[PDB]
């Protein structure tokens, strides 16, 4: 049953053409050939629609940059996906439940988009995820318990956003987390004990946030940084434990001695 242009978008079609190594997008393809695609990689693309990808069931790895694509609903059928990487500077909304079937997902990367908010429970089914990166978006808040089901997460990157606060106990379930990046945000404070259960943590980035160093509000963070100073890292040149700085003073958060 040979057919092609199962992908209406022309840029994406050439991408499927290149993957299957054929003359043009008019060339027919079988189902056996569609089932041969394990990896799609579309750098620096102009793809506007990924319609037709729902029929590539054995795709395990997808990485795509496009300044035009804003719909990603087709990807909810790729149940064998282990690696997803998307750089869509127009993606503003995540379809409802889109990742709820991608239960074999190990690494999820969403960067340079415009998501200002995340749906509730969006990740709850990805119980096998090890790596989650959401940098350079516009997130202003996180949903309650949004990470609670990713019990096997080892790396979480939330840098370069607009986060003003963190929900209570948001990292409490992530007992195998080793790398967490919160730098380049708008955080004035963290919840008390927000890091107390991260027993495998080895690297944390806290700088470029406007920390409010009024006592007692900054007490937990200042005391935590001094107790766990070996785990603090920095991408700006500063003694790493001193890289979290008070707004106004510019003094290091860990230099603030709050009573009792």
């Amino acid at each position: 049953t040979p057919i092609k242009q199962i992908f209406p978008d022309d840029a994406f079609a050439e991408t499927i053409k290149a993957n299957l190594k054929k003359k043009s997008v008019t060339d027919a393809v079988t189902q056996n050939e569609l089932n041969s695609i394990d990896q799609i990689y579309a750098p620096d693309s102009d793809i506007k629609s990924v319609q037709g990808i729902q029929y590539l069931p054995n795709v395990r790895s997808l990485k795509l940059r496009s300044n035009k694509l804003h719909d990603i609903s087709a990807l909810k059928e790729l149940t064998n996906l282990t690696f997803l990487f998307l750089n869509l500077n127009q993606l503003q909304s995540l379809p409802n439940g889109v990742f709820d079937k991608l239960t074999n997902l190990k690494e999820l990367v969403l960067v340079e988009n415009q998501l200002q908010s995340l749906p509730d429970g969006v990740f709850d089914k990805l119980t096998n995820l090890t790596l989650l990166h959401l940098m350079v978006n516009q997130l202003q808040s996180l949903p309650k318990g949004v990470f609670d089901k990713l019990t096997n997460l080892t790396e979480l990157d939330l840098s370069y956003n607009q986060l003003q606060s963190l929900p209570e106990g948001v990292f409490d379930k992530l007992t195998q987390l080793k790398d967490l990046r919160l730098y380049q945000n708008q955080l004035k404070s963290v919840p008390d004990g927000v890091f107390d259960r991260l027993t495998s943590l080895q690297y944390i980035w806290l700088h470029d946030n406007p920390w409010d160093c009024t006592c007692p509000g900054i007490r937990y963070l200042s005391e935590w940084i001094n107790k766990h100073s070996g785990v603090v890292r920095s991408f700006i040149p500063l003694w790493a434990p001193d890289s979290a700085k008070c707004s106004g003073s510019g003094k290091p958060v860990r230099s603030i001695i709050c009573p009792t």
């Binding site: 990689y41 750098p43 620096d44 990485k63 500077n89 340079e112 350079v136 516009q138 370069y160 607009q162 380049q184 080895q202 690297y203 070996g230 890292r233 920095s234 991408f235 700006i236 040149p237 500063l238 003694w239 790493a240 434990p241």
Partner: protein, 196 residues
């Protein structure tokens, strides 16, 4: 007849940052690749389009030696056909590469308590680099629709960060020095040969 200056590329006290990667053109000299390959000094010694056991037996028009520092878990990106921040935005090898990628742990030289910030990489770019392209620009990156006017702010980010290697990092996070040898045979006599 003169000796190729590989001791200068491999044993230099300071290496370049990967975004400002440093190229040295090697010509008119004798080089002993076999002593390097059998030395048991390197954690990575992978060659493409040529066998490492036959390098002393060949001659070339020019050898290029590009060196820099990256993290241990980024050495995999210094290979043909790879993707990621380093291959996309800092050092890109061509698909048809002919040469060798050599790397070694430099935690003892390039890591410092509190961090080593003299090594940088580029985090953002408009488009992937082309093979062997070098971009040393320090212009604010426009992650949004608004112009930045050369001033940092929201969605207007300085494009370079420091690695901040600490000696207590795990190996994948420790610094590694990298030497990429490119073997060229243009229309000329080959003046870079193995030992006589």
């Amino acid at each position: 007849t003169n000796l190729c200056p590989f001791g200068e590329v491999f044993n230099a006290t300071r290496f370049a940052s990967v975004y400002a990667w440093n190229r040295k053109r090697i010509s008119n000299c004798v080089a002993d690749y076999s002593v390097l390959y059998n030395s048991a000094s390197f954690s990575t010694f992978k060659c493409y389009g040529v066998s490492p056991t036959k390098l002393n037996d060949l001659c070339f028009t020019n050898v290029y030696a590009d060196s820099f520092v990256i993290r241990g878990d980024e050495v995999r990106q210094i290979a043909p056909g790879q993707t990621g921040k380093i291959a996309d935005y800092n050092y890109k090898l061509p698909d048809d590469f002919t040469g060798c990628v050599i790397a070694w742990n430099s935690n003892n030289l390039d890591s410092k308590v509190g961090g080593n910030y003299n090594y940088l990489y580029r985090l953002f770019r408009k488009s992937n680099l082309k093979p062997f392209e070098r971009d040393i620009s320090t212009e604010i990156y426009q992650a949004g629709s608004t112009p930045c006017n050369g001033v940092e702010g929201f969605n207007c980010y300085f494009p370079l960060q420091s690695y901040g290697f600490q000696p207590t990092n795990g190996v994948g996070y420790q610094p590694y020095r990298v030497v990429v040898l490119s073997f060229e045979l243009l229309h000329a006599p080959a003046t870079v040969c193995g030992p006589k």
